[PDB]
Design a protein around this ligand. Structure first.
Ligand SMILES: *[C@@H]1O[C@H](CO)[C@@H](O)[C@H](O)[C@H]1NC(C)=O
Ligand SMILES: *[C@@H]1O[C@H](CO)[C@@H](O)[C@H](O)[C@H]1NC(C)=O
Ligand SMILES: *[C@@H]1O[C@H](CO)[C@@H](O)[C@H](O)[C@H]1NC(C)=O
Lengths: 183, 16, 182
């Protein structure tokens, strides 16, 4: 379809966690989502929250409708469960790597299904469990998913990082290696 | 009470 | 070994072009789109056999059909006018870094929005096209993009390499110069 811009409400439900997600994207960037537990709208950028508002009830109402149609489609499909599509993992920095200058390592997990995932940052083999940001399970036009994980770090020559990814389509955990000299 | 229910489209608004 | 899991997805897509809005509503079981409304068609259509009961029932409810036919004006146009005044005004200027890595000079352009960008390599004032290898546009997920444009080079003493970047956030092109050593 010819389009200058594409604005999409995307939502899904499933048996395993996360059981529901409701978000809106503009030109493939998540602009806001409805936190289903807090029952409130979360804006990706603060400027969006100052300019816009969205009734969180609209997202909860559509999630319930999605759960209704899920039960109906489970029975109609004769309990058809789709195959596991394993994820593609890439790790790269946000900024040019300068030793001593704060940076953000990005782990991008792509083309996977179902949206069930464990991701862990390893710094010199040790998990980083705090101060780590992550995106929603982001939709793709082929109805698989992708996702971003973020790690603040200071580059140094001796350090080694790993994005450890677990998915049902993988025989073993997937480890994408990265270091300051990685191209 | 409907098997095949349609989702409803709602828009965002200017901030309060 | 895979636990029992079923997935249901819904999409509501508005396509803005030339002052018009085209609305698409998709109903998906796992990864299979089975029902769809397209404002260019005006009615629901079954994409697979799983959607025939839905499309048949929904097309029989004129209240449902009239609501979906009005979405391009009531929701798509409404949301687009808001995004025009804020989201489409977002301008983040690219940051440009040139550094050496056979022998490759790398123009790392970072943290820019929107995504449309022009990056050109110049050697002693002449634009180069051969040995230029650009990554695709890399989406960082935080409403910023980055791109890496590599140039294979044979550096003589006194060669002047320039990476030039053009972007709607810039009133004039940004140039970063790297003078060859060796
Ligand atoms: C489910 O099984 C029944 C019984 O064989 C069959 O008639 C029907 O077509 C099946 N549906 C699907 C979606 O496979
Ligand atoms: C995530 O880890 C838990 C245990 O911590 C495990 O039970 C679960 O299967 C993992 N998920 C995936 C998708 O591998
Ligand atoms: C856009 O609308 C104008 C209005 O006259 C029309 O001439 C043009 O063909 C349309 N399409 C494009 C791609 O400009």
């Amino acid at each position: 379809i010819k389009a200058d811009h594409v604005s999409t409400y995307a939502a899904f439900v499933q048996t395993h966690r996360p059981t529901g997600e409701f978000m809106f994207e503009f030109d493939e960037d998540e602009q806001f989502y409805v936190d289903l537990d807090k029952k409130e709208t979360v804006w990706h950028l603060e400027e969006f929250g100052r300019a816009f508002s969205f009734e969180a009830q609209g997202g909860l109402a559509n999630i319930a409708i999605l759960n209704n149609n899920l039960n109906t489609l489970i029975q109609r499909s004769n309990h058809t469960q789709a195959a596991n599509d394993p994820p593609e993992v890439t790790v790269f920095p946000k900024e040019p790597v300068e030793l001593g200058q704060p940076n953000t390592l990005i782990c991008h997990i792509d083309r996977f299904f179902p949206p069930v995932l464990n991701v862990t940052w390893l710094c010199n083999g040790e998990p980083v469990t705090e101060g780590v940001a992550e995106s929603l399970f982001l939709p793709r036009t082929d109805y698989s998913f992708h996702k971003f994980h973020y790690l603040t770090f200071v580059p140094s020559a001796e350090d080694v990082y790993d994005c450890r990814v677990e998915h049902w389509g993988l025989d073993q955990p997937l480890l994408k290696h990265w270091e300051a000299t990685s191209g | 009470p409907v098997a095949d229910a349609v989702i409803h489209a709602s828009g965002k608004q200017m901030w309060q | 070994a895979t636990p029992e899991n079923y997935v249901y997805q819904g999409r509501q897509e508005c396509y803005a072009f030339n002052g018009t809005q085209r609305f698409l509503e998709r109903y998906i079981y796992n990864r299979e789109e089975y029902a769809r409304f397209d404002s260019d068609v005006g009615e629901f259509r079954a994409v697979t056999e799983l959607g025939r009961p839905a499309a048949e029932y929904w097309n029989s409810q004129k209240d449902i059909l009239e609501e979906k036919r009005a979405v391009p004006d009531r929701v798509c146009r409404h949301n687009y006018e808001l995004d025009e005044a804020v989201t489409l005004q977002r301008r983040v200027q690219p940051k440009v870094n040139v550094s050496p890595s056979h022998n490759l000079l790398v123009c790392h352009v970072t943290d820019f929005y929107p995504g449309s960008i022009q990056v050109r390599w110049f050697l002693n004032g002449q634009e180069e096209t051969a040995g230029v290898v650009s990554t695709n546009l890399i989406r960082n997920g935080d409403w910023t993009f980055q791109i890496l444009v590599m140039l294979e080079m044979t550096p003589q003493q006194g060669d002047v390499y320039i990476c030039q970047v053009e972007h709607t956030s810039l009133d004039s092109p940004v140039t970063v110069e790297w003078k060859a050593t060796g």
